[PDB]
Structures are given as structure tokens and as C-alpha cells.
Amino acid sequence: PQYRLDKALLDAEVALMTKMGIEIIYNTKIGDDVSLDYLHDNYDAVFLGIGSWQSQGLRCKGEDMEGVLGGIDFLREVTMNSNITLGGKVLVVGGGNTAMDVARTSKRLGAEEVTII
Amino acid sequence: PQYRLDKALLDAEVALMTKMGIEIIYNTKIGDDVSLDYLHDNYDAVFLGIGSWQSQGLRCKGEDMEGVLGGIDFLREVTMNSNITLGGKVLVVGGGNTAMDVARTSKRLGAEEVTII
Ligand SMILES: NC(=O)C1=CN([C@@H]2O[C@H](COP(=O)(O)OP(=O)(O)OC[C@H]3O[C@@H](n4cnc5c(N)ncnc54)[C@H](OP(=O)(O)O)[C@@H]3O)[C@@H](O)[C@H]2O)C=CC1
Ligand SMILES: NC(=O)C1=CN([C@@H]2O[C@H](COP(=O)(O)OP(=O)(O)OC[C@H]3O[C@@H](n4cnc5c(N)ncnc54)[C@H](OP(=O)(O)O)[C@@H]3O)[C@@H](O)[C@H]2O)C=CC1
């Protein structure tokens, strides 16, 4: 979240790094926009740092109903200044750092009462 | 074929054109390496000049047997200085300009007798 890490610091550091001669191409998803065979043919080496960008579901009955959303997706829409819906009462399921970030961002986003399960 | 069009002329003209500020990216097949949705998102317009790059088959019995090859593929392997096999006797089926180019390139490539059907 923004209150813990300022994005201006991150942007300034990446600008410092790209001054060194590293080219960053945004909005390019490998396998969906550009093949991996293309990168394999055109480059002397390939490194995959894709990360873990899926959210585990509730693993319960009715987990597919409307009104249930993952924590990672929620934080991504918060970051991109998109249009979200929260409501007065929000229940966050989990106990790691994702749950803490979701709960505190929800408290900042006008949720009147937030409870962690 | 090279004896009718010199490739040095074509290369010099394309160099003249690319001096004007046009970037040409080689070895990039759209739909196989780069998606068309990528170009649709990243560019203000897209023009498709892909051409007709398939050869019609013989439409006869045994057309899939080894030893039968298309004219376009044959001319492409001649151009790329690849390793081909012809033999003493070659039969070219067709009557257009593709047949003429194939027959004359075959006469230059050591075929002792070439016949056009
Ligand atoms: N990379 C990071 O920053 C770290 C991740 N986290 C937390 O862990 C998550 C992912 O890492 P990892 O620890 O491997 O993930 P886990 O699969 O271990 O899940 C982590 C959290 O969810 C609980 N949990 C998992 N499955 C269920 C289920 N069916 N029902 C109820 N609770 C469940 C765990 O509690 P329990 O203690 O009982 O296992 C814990 O609170 C993050 O989303 C975050 O919440 C926390 C610290 C470091
Ligand atoms: N772009 C170019 O440069 C032009 C193309 N060509 C010729 O035409 C071809 C492609 O253009 P297009 O004319 O539309 O192609 P076509 O499908 O009309 O075929 C052209 C040639 O093949 C003959 N042919 C077609 N199908 C069969 C079959 N089953 N059996 C035997 N002969 C057949 C035609 O003779 P028929 O006279 O009886 O139709 C003609 O010689 C080229 O490969 C080339 O050979 C020639 C001039 C211009």
C-alpha cells in the first residue's frame, strides 16, 4: 500500500536504473502478446521473474458468488485508481500480510467496520 | 529469380527508404510470434500486406508422396542458398510465371532435362 511504500521512491530508483542502459518495455505479456519462442530465438539468454500473481479462493460453498473478490485483485484495483465497491461492512479472510494490507486499505477507503476472520 | 532481378538493387532501394525514418523489424511473424491484439493496442493503425504465400497442390492421386514439392517453396529454398535436391530429370506442372521461373532456375541448377506439363 501507498502509506507504507511511496511510489515516487520506486519510480525514482527505476529511473536511476534505466539511466544505466536497461530498456523496459511495458504492457507486454509474454505468452499472451509475445511468444517465448520469439525471445528464445532473438536473445542470448532469458530469465523468468514472473512472480506469483494468483489469489487462492475461499475453498468453501458459494465461493463463486458475486460479492466475493480476491485480495490481490482488490489491491491492484486500489493501486490503479479504478472504480471499486466496498460497502459499509467488509470481512477479510486470512491472517498474513495480505490480510493486514487489505484490512487497513479498507479502513482508509471508507469502510465503517472491518473484521478479520 | 536473381538473373531477372538483382537483389542488390532491392537492398539499395530499401536502404534509401529506411533512411527516411521507417523501422523494419525482421524475423517477426504476426500471429505466431507477436499477437495482432498487441499491435492493435499499441498502434494508431494497422495495415496487413501479408500476400499469398501458399502453393496449390497437384490435386491428384499420390500428391502427398515424397519427391513432390511446391514451386514457391522450391524458389524460396533456392533464394536462401539452402541445400536442395533436384536430380537429372524434373517435371514442372503449370503454365504461369511460377512455372517459367521454376523451369529456368532448374535449368541453371544442373538439371539435364526440364519439361513443362
Ligand atoms: N510474501 C509474503 O509477504 C508473505 C505472505 N504472507 C501471507 O501468506 C499468503 C501467501 O503465502 P503463504 O503463507 O505461502 O500462503 P498460505 O497458503 O500459507 O496462507 C497464508 C494465510 O492464510 C491461512 N490459510 C491458508 N489456507 C486457508 C483456508 N482454506 N482457510 C483459511 N485460512 C487459510 C494461513 O493461516 P495458518 O497460519 O493457519 O497457516 C495464513 O493466514 C499471503 O497472501 C499472506 O496472507 C505472510 C507473510 C509473508
Ligand atoms: N502474380 C503473377 O505473377 C501471375 C501468376 N501467374 C501464374 O498463376 C499462378 C497463380 O495465379 P492464378 O492465375 O490465380 O492461379 P491459377 O489457379 O489460375 O493457376 C494458374 C496456372 O495453373 C493452371 N492450373 C490451375 N489449376 C490447375 C490443376 N488442377 N491442374 C492443372 N493446371 C492447373 C493454369 O492454366 P489455365 O490457363 O488453364 O488456367 C495456369 O497455368 C502462379 O503460380 C503462376 O503459375 C501467371 C501470371 C501472373
Distance of alpha carbon A97 from alpha carbon A94, whole angstroms: 9
**By the 8 A CB rule, do A112 and A88 touch?**
yes
Q: List the grid coordinates of B111.
A: 538439371
Angle subtended at Cα A25 by Cα B14 and Cα B22, rounded to the nearest 5 degrees:
15
**By the 8 A CB rule, do B111 and B91 touch?**
no
Distance of alpha carbon B94 from alpha carbon B68, whole angstroms: 14
Residue stretches of the annotated binding site of A for NADPH: 56, 95, 97-98
Q: How far is B113 from chain A (nearest CA, A)?
A: 41
B→A interface, C-beta within 8 Å: 27-28, 32-35, 37-38, 41-42
At B22, which helix (H) or strand (E)? none
Distance of alpha carbon A110 from alpha carbon A105, whole angstroms: 9
Q: Report CA torsion sign: A85, A89, A91, A95.
A: positive
Distance (angstroms) between ligand 1 centre and the Cα of A110 equals 26
Contact at CB, A42 and B32, closer than 8 angstroms? no
Residues written for chain A: 117
Q: List the grid coordinates of B18.
A: 529506411
Mutate to test the interface with B, among A35, A37, A39, A42 (most CBs of B within 10 A): A35
Nearest CA to ligand 2 atom 17: B56
Angle subtended at Cα A84 by Cα A81 and Cα A85, rounded to the nearest 5 degrees:
155
The string of DSSP codes covering B57-97 is ---STTTTSTT---HHHHHHHHHTT------SEEEE---SH
Distance of alpha carbon B9 from alpha carbon B13, whole angstroms: 6
* Helix (H/G/I), strand (E/B), else coil: A28: coil
Q: Is B13 exposed, middle or buried (0-12, 13-18, 19+ CB in 10 A)?
A: exposed
Report the chain B residue with the minimal C-alpha distance to residue A38: B33
Please list, residue by residue across A61-99, b when 16 or more beta carbons sit within 10 angstroms of its beta carbon and e when fewer do.
Answer: eeeeeeeeeebbebbeebeeeeeeeeeeebebebeeebe
Residue B106: CB atoms within 10 Å: 19
**Spatial CB neighbours of A55, under 8 Å, sequence gap ≥ 6:** A70, A71, A72, A73
* Helix (H/G/I), strand (E/B), else coil: B110: coil
**By the 8 A CB rule, do B75 and B103 touch?**
no
At A49, which amino acid appears? G
Query: Distance from CA of residue A26 to its chain's centroid?
Result: 16
Supply the Cα-derived Rg of chain B in whole angstroms.
19
Distance of alpha carbon B68 from alpha carbon A29, whole angstroms: 41
Contact at CB, A33 and B38, closer than 8 angstroms? yes
Distance of alpha carbon B12 from alpha carbon A89, whole angstroms: 70
Residues written for chain B: 117
Name the phi and psi angles at B112, rounded to 5. -75, -35
Measured between CB atoms, which of A28, A32, A35 is closest to B33? A35
Distance of alpha carbon B109 from alpha carbon B86, whole angstroms: 8
Pairing mode, strands A113-116 and B89-92: unpaired
**Spatial CB neighbours of A43, under 8 Å, sequence gap ≥ 6:** none
Distance of alpha carbon A15 from alpha carbon A27, whole angstroms: 18
Cα within 13 Å of Cα(A26), Cβ side: 0
Q: Which residues line ligand 2 (CB under 6 A)?
A: B 59, 94-99
Method underlying the structure: cryo-EM
